[PDB]
Design a protein around this nucleic acid. Structure first.
Ligand SMILES: [Mg+2]
Ligand SMILES: [Mg+2]
Ligand SMILES: [Mg+2]
Ligand SMILES: [Mg+2]
Ligand SMILES: [Mg+2]
Ligand SMILES: [Mg+2]
Ligand SMILES: [Mg+2]
Ligand SMILES: [Mg+2]
Ligand SMILES: [Mg+2]
Ligand SMILES: [Mg+2]
Ligand SMILES: [Mg+2]
Ligand SMILES: [Mg+2]
Ligand SMILES: [Mg+2]
Ligand SMILES: [Mg+2]
Ligand SMILES: [Mg+2]
Ligand SMILES: [Mg+2]
Ligand SMILES: [Mg+2]
Ligand SMILES: [Mg+2]
Ligand SMILES: [Mg+2]
Ligand SMILES: [Mg+2]
Ligand SMILES: [Mg+2]
Ligand SMILES: [Mg+2]
Ligand SMILES: [Mg+2]
Ligand SMILES: [Mg+2]
Ligand SMILES: [Mg+2]
Ligand SMILES: [Mg+2]
Ligand SMILES: [Mg+2]
Ligand SMILES: [Mg+2]
Ligand SMILES: [Mg+2]
Ligand SMILES: [Mg+2]
Lengths: 80, 205, 122, 156, 129, 82
RNA sequence: UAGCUAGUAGGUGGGGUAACGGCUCACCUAGGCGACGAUCCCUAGCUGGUCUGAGAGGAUGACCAGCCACACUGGAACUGA
RNA sequence: CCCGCAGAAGAAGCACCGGCUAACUCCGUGCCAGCAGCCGCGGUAAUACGGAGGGUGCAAGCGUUAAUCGGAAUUACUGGGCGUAAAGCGCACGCAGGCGGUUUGUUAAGUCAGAUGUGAAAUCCCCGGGCUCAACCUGGGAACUGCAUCUGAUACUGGCAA
């Protein structure tokens, strides 16, 4: 069992790399409202299999680029 | 520190008898206890809510001989301590060593008892204690040391204490000149004319 | 009011400025009397109130009231000023400290001697 | 037996053709300590007559309040013209911590320990009325058990 | 639009008690039936009855004691604009324990006292006094 | 290196030492890894005065921690008395 | 202050580091960030904590302790774990 | 720290007293001199300006100034408002965003429960201990409202399916 996060592929234009929004349902510190906040992450994916708008599971790894420290594990719900 | 002015002046201003003198003579004979001190003493102005609260606090402070900083610290400790705040405050003021000596009867006035304590006449559990504000604990023996056992004022004070009403929470032996602090004086043991709500409210503004 | 609106834009605390900005968060400040004169007070009252235009060490030139009966101040006289306005004097927001550098205490005072820099009589 | 105290005396004017006619208004509160409290408001050309009229009115129109060991039974709010009032059943020994008119009303009512605060307007007449109304709108465990058709042990 | 049916249910009860109506009816729901059951158990209403098959109507029979309403005040707490969740130690006491607080827990809708006894928190639906 | 030593605490003329294991480079009262006892030089009678967690001290010594002379004397005293 | 960014965003290969990496270079791709506030401007060492407050909060970061930065000003490396 | 010597011997001041706010009279002065945090006071009987007597409050300190929070529910999350007191866009359409009638299934993201790791020490709080007491020092606990992981619950919210 390893720590991993699910998210939607925002963009896949740069080769072998994708952008994965990992939006989280946090609560506001003061007012108590539950606000949807988003976390964009550059994820490394070999074979460029992922498309935009899909869902992907990713895990943390050693840094592969200036902004890329996450790697794809599996693609799920990749409909268009 | 200590108030060094006329004591019957404080008694007249407050209105009641604060036991600031030995009590051989009536306070009505020693002074005009009814009239307030000063040029405008005969006039009796109407006191407001803050006035009566301040009056009550001043009465307690003058009776026990405690200044504002020490009294405020006593209130803070009493509020912190569990239980009734006013009762705890009264219990602490009773716990004061000079008050204990006066209650046992080794002093005509609380000032005289404080005089003995300061001049190193008092042993607590075989330890010469010099501070008047020393908090006496239950099951503590308080004795007059042999140096002061020869003082005639102690014997005269013992006679005056025999005249006064004896406290139940202490047990004093006059021949040995030593008393045991049995327990904390309850509110029923303490005087009824003293009101605690006013003090608590005044310091809880 | 709505928590959604508050999340979008919180409540911005109302910054209250100080009424004595020449002191610059200092209890007192030193200055030089540029001019000593008297002024007429505001409408409901009347007098000749003694004031000083003072150049402060931090560049500001302010006007300061001179409390007490009589003063020895003149031009080119270093004084110490503190906060506090005289109300019925337009633009005067500072008091001179009696009993300070090159400022004498009020003569023949027996009460409020500490406020007017008067030493204890024998 | 009935403890009474005068809260405020106010001078008012009428401004008649001749000049101004002044008169005095007295706000008083009486109570038995055991729980009954009632306020009175009177008016006369002179202060003693106004106070006496207020005392009579206060003696009349009393209301019973369910007191639990000399303090409130639950936190209670009270509202009126401007006065919004909150009162809390504080522990024994704390004393009555309240501002002015509320202090007078609660003291004559007989509550010895409360934590109160007056929001909104603090006009003596309105705050006294709001405090009395809040005390009125305060039910006891016996009352709630009876109305809900249960025992006090089921309510706790 | 209708955003919160539960607040509508509580408003109907409050308005009915104010207007001295014997019964109040509303479009029935599963959550509404659970809340009505809790109210009847606590004794703030006399009875409830769900009636109908396609679109059932829940009918509550209001309760009066001496000409005054039994439900003195009933306030919605959690709402769509602001959800309220509490842990078992933070469960509120309505009217110093005299009133009840409806809390939706993992084990169904129950009063705050029952949830506290169970030892678990949940979403605080409403206060009833 | 890692060592067991005394850190001075208390008031003027009334020292009270905390027996702590810490990197030698750190300051006397500064950063420390673990507090494994205390020592009171002015402790009166009817008082333990010293308290050393011998298990933790043994563990750290096995790890390779050196011991100051005063702490060694305290360990000697504790073992002798006990 | 509404647009900012060409080593800039990613890839392949060499080089470099104790270590991963545009850290550096050559080539290839045309990306990357930003209204959930990028960029720009003003102010500011951060925290445990301190003061106040019923609480929530507000103000603050002296002394003690942890971390960071600096050593006349601006650069640079050498020695060395 | 203890013992001895002598002798009340060497040791009290500051602010305030019109209301807010505990504490009043006389004399001097006459919209002058002056006071003042606010309201205000002073033009010939000033409890508000100066002096005196008396008193009140603190006390080896007492006042003034500066600064922060409080009172201020006067930035309102707890905890405000918008017909006339400040406040509903001149009116509509509508993207992002916020919110979502009812039933069943499923998931377990939000939510809840338990456990584990961590949340430095000091500080705060509770029960004690040592300085003659206190400040101060100190033992043990509690707390650090948090974060992460794992195991469960499925009422509500969310996702998916009908
Ligand atoms: Mg108002
Ligand atoms: Mg490379
Ligand atoms: Mg290589
Ligand atoms: Mg990198
Ligand atoms: Mg700086
Ligand atoms: Mg507050
Ligand atoms: Mg900060
Ligand atoms: Mg410094
Ligand atoms: Mg220099
Ligand atoms: Mg250099
Ligand atoms: Mg070397
Ligand atoms: Mg080298
Ligand atoms: Mg007065
Ligand atoms: Mg004055
Ligand atoms: Mg006169
Ligand atoms: Mg005067
Ligand atoms: Mg200030
Ligand atoms: Mg506020
Ligand atoms: Mg308003
Ligand atoms: Mg208008
Ligand atoms: Mg308007
Ligand atoms: Mg319109
Ligand atoms: Mg729904
Ligand atoms: Mg939605
Ligand atoms: Mg979950
Ligand atoms: Mg800690
Ligand atoms: Mg002790
Ligand atoms: Mg401790
Ligand atoms: Mg679900
Ligand atoms: Mg669902």
């Amino acid at each position: 069992k390893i720590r991993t996060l699910q998210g939607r592929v925002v963009s896949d234009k740069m080769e072998k790399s994708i952008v994965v929004a990992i939006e989280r349902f946090v609560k506001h510190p003061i007012y108590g409202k539950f606000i949807k906040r988003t976390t964009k992450l550059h994820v490394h994916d070999e074979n460029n299999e992922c498309g935009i708008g899909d869902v992907v599971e990713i895990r943390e790894c050693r840094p592969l680029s200036k902004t890329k420290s996450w790697t794809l594990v599996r693609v799920v719900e990749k409909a268009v | 520190a200590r108030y060094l002015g006329p004591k019957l002046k404080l008694s007249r201003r407050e209105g009641t008898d604060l036991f600031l003198k030995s009590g051989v003579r009536a306070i009505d004979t020693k002074c005009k206890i009814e009239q307030a001190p000063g040029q405008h003493g005969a006039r009796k102005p109407r006191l407001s809510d803050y006035g009566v609260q301040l009056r009550e606090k001043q009465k307690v402070r003058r009776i026990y001989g405690v200044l504002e900083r020490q009294f405020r610290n006593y209130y803070k400790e009493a509020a912190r301590l569990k239980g009734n705040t006013g009762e705890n405050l009264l219990a602490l003021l009773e716990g004061r060593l000079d008050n204990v000596v006066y209650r046992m009867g080794f002093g005509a006035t609380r000032a005289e008892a404080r005089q003995l304590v300061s001049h190193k006449a008092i042993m607590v559990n075989g330890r010469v204690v010099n501070i008047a504000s020393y908090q006496v604990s239950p099951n503590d023996v308080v004795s007059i040391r042999e140096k002061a056992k020869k003082q005639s004022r102690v014997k005269a004070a013992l006679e005056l204490a025999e005249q006064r009403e004896k406290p139940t929470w202490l047990e004093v032996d006059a021949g040995k000149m030593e008393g045991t602090f049995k327990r904390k004086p309850e509110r029923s043991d303490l005087s009824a004319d003293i009101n605690e709500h006013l003090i608590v409210e005044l310091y809880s503004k | 009011a709505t928590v959604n609106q508050l999340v979008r834009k919180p409540r911005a605390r109302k910054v209250a400025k100080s009424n004595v900005p020449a002191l610059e968060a200092c209890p007192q400040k030193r200055g030089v009397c540029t001019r000593v004169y008297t002024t007429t007070p505001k409408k409901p009252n009347s007098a000749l109130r003694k004031v000083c235009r003072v150049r402060l060490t931090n560049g500001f030139e302010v006007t300061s009231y001179i409390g007490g009966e009589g003063h020895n101040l003149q031009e080119h006289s270093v004084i110490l000023i503190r906060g506090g306005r005289v109300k019925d004097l337009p633009g005067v927001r500072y008091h001179t400290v009696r009993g300070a550098l090159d400022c004498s205490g009020v003569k023949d005072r027996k009460q409020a001697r500490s406020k007017y820099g008067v030493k204890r009589p024998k | 037996e009935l403890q009474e105290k005068l809260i405020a005396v106010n001078r008012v004017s009428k401004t008649v053709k001749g000049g101004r006619i002044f008169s005095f208004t007295a706000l008083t509160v009486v109570g038995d300590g055991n729980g009954r409290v009632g306020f009175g408001y009177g008016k006369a050309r002179e202060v003693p007559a106004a106070i006496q009229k207020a005392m009579e009115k206060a003696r009349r129109n009393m209301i019973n309040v369910a007191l639990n060991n000399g303090t409130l039974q639950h936190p209670v709010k009270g509202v009126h013209t401007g006065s919004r009032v909150f009162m809390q059943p504080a522990s024994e020994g704390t004393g009555i911590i309240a501002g002015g008119a509320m202090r007078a009303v609660l003291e004559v009512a007989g509550v010895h320990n409360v934590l109160a605060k007056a929001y909104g307007s603090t006009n003596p007449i309105n705050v006294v009325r709001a405090t009395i109304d809040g005390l009125e709108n305060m039910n006891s465990p016996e009352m709630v058990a009876a109305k809900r058709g249960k025992s006090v042990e089921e309510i706790l | 639009s209708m955003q919160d049916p539960i607040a509508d249910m509580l408003t109907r009860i409050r308005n009915g008690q104010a207007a001295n109506k014997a019964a109040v009816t509303m479009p029935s729901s599963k959550l509404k039936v659970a809340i009505a059951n809790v109210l009847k158990e606590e004794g703030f209403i006399e009875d409830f009855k769900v009636e109908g098959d396609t679109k059932p109507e829940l009918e509550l029979t209001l309760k009066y004691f001496q000409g005054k309403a039994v439900v003195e005040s009933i306030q919605r707490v959690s709402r769509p604009g602001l959800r309220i969740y509490k842990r078992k130690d933070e469960l509120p006491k309505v009217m110093a324990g005299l009133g009840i607080a409806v809390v939706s827990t993992s084990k169904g809708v129950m009063t705050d006292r029952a949830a506290r006894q169970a030892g678990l928190g949940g979403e605080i639906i409403c206060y009833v006094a | 290196m890692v060592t067991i030593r005394l850190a001075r605490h208390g008031a003027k003329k009334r020292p009270f030492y905390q027996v702590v294991v810490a990197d030698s480079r750190n300051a006397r009262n500064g950063r420390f890894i673990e507090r494994v006892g205390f020592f009171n030089p002015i402790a009166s009678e009817k008082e333990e005065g010293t308290r050393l967690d011998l298990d933790r001290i043994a563990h750290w010594v096995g790890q390779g921690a050196t011991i100051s002379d005063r702490v060694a004397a305290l360990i000697k005293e504790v073992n002798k008395a006990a």
